[PDB]
């Protein structure tokens, strides 16, 4: 449980082969196929049945590929550079001109999307259970060839947890979260869709 859906990871380990263990009968276990493309034949436990195999990776190590105490801990280089950035009085222009270098004009749209990346402070009522939403929502409408898809693609490239979708190639199951059932197991399970993989992040919908 050190990793979540939507993460991108490096794994170190070994490649292994696992059998179809339901075909065998031994003391303590009879075969599930008897209770309820050609394989290997000959074993005492395989009376008439046959055995086949699947690949699997046996992980030895997994990791993802990429507050005052934390501020103290990022001590020399990060505090120097970030404090100079915080002192910069034209940081709004200097950030938007680096986030969107290929787009001319549209200063209002650039600033609004930059504020959407930061967002407000979410607050909970102390006993009612109600809450005040801190997330910001932005919509773009305009004529053909006005760089709407360019802006959305740039946001999804920059942000760490952002996802891009098209409205013509999506379903209500795949957009946010979905129900699935297993066939290794047989119980029902939940798939985290694109909105939940972009939880605490940005979901971009083109051709809404």
């Amino acid at each position: 449980e050190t990793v979540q859906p939507g993460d991108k990871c490096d794994i170190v380990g070994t490649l292994i082969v696992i059998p179809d263990i339901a075909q065998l009968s031994t003391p303590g276990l009879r075969a599930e196929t008897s209770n309820q493309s050609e394989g290997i034949t000959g074993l005492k436990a395989l009376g008439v049945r046959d055995l086949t195999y699947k690949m699997a990776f046996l992980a030895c190590h997994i990791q993802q590929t990429e507050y005052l105490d934390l501020w103290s801990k990022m001590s020399t280089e990060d505090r120097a550079t970030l404090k100079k950035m915080s002192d910069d009085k034209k940081i709004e222009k200097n950030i938007v001109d680096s986030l969107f270098p290929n787009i001319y004009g549209n200063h209002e749209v650039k600033l609004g999307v930059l504020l959407m990346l930061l967002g407000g402070v979410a607050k909970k009522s102390r006993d009612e259970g109600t809450s005040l939403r801190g997330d910001i929502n932005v919509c773009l409408v305009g004529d053909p060839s006005t760089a709407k898809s360019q802006v959305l693609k740039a946001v999804e490239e920059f942000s760490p947890r952002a996802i891009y979708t098209s409205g013509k190639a999506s379903s209500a199951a795949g957009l946010t979260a979905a129900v699935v059932k297993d066939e290794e197991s047989f119980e029902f399970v939940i798939e985290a869709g694109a909105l939940m993989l972009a939880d605490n992040g940005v979901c971009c919908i083109d051709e809404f």
């Binding site: 449980e1 599930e32 290794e184 993989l197």
Partner: protein, 244 residues
């Protein structure tokens, strides 16, 4: 009245998430919390069993019913042989049984994760004590058992796990609608004053300013006509943002 007094134990100091239980906690006492999603009906389960010996009429037992077994004898000692067996209707004992499913609270889940869930078993006077949707807190023993079909499902010798409940607190139990003599004296002293109608009307929703017609309609609708519908029905229509 009874045969045995049970001891329930509360305020155990260490809490665990459902998400964080490991093989360390097997056969240990733990406390968790969550939301009920599914509950079965109440059913009787075998507790203590005795059997007849068909060969000589001797009564075999008692056998305390274990958790996951079909307990039976094999030899009757009074005839020293493997006589046939029947269930003794007259001396078998039962108790109530229920099974529920509990999920992690949505408030406590971190970023982008899915909540986990466990099954909980209730026996005796713990049955029928909660509904789906209730925020509850459970104290019990965390245990494991083998399941060959679960082994065949996962492809590895995994084990099924459960919690046997020992104490429950339901956080969503409403307050008791019972009044003390002090409360009834306060109600009488309030009712004696002449300005009581305007007190009630204006003191409903004190943050909202004006709209005394809506306030009086709500106030007279909280009380009821005597009855032949006795209920007084109210409808509001208004522009968005008008605090309706």
């Amino acid at each position: 009245v009874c045969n045995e007094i049970k001891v329930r134990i509360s305020q155990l100091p260490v809490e665990e998430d459902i998400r964080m239980l490991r093989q360390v906690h097997l056969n240990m006492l733990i406390r968790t919390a969550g939301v009920v999603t599914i509950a079965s009906g109440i059913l009787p389960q075998l507790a203590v069993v005795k059997y007849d010996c068909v060969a000589c009429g001797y009564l075999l037992g008692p056998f305390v019913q274990q958790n996951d077994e079909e307990v039976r004898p094999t030899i009757c000692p009074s005839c020293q042989g493997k006589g046939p067996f029947e269930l003794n209707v007259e001396n078998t004992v039962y108790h109530n049984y229920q099974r529920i499913t509990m999920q992690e609270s949505p408030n406590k889940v971190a970023a982008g994760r899915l909540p986990r869930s466990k099954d909980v078993i209730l026996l005796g006077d713990l049955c029928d004590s909660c509904k789906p949707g209730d925020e509850i807190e459970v104290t019990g023993v965390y245990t494991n058992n083998f399941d060959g079909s679960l082994n065949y499902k996962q492809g590895f010798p995994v084990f099924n796990t459960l919690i046997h409940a020992n104490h429950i607190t339901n956080k969503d139990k409403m307050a008791s609608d019972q009044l003390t003599d002090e409360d009834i004296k306060a109600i009488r002293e309030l009712s004696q004053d002449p300005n009581i109608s305007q007190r009630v009307f204006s003191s409903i929703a004190p943050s909202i300013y004006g709209h005394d017609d809506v306030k009086r309609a709500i106030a007279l609708a909280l009380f009821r006509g005597e009855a032949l519908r006795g209920d007084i029905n109210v409808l509001l229509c208004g522009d968005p943002g008008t605090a309706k």
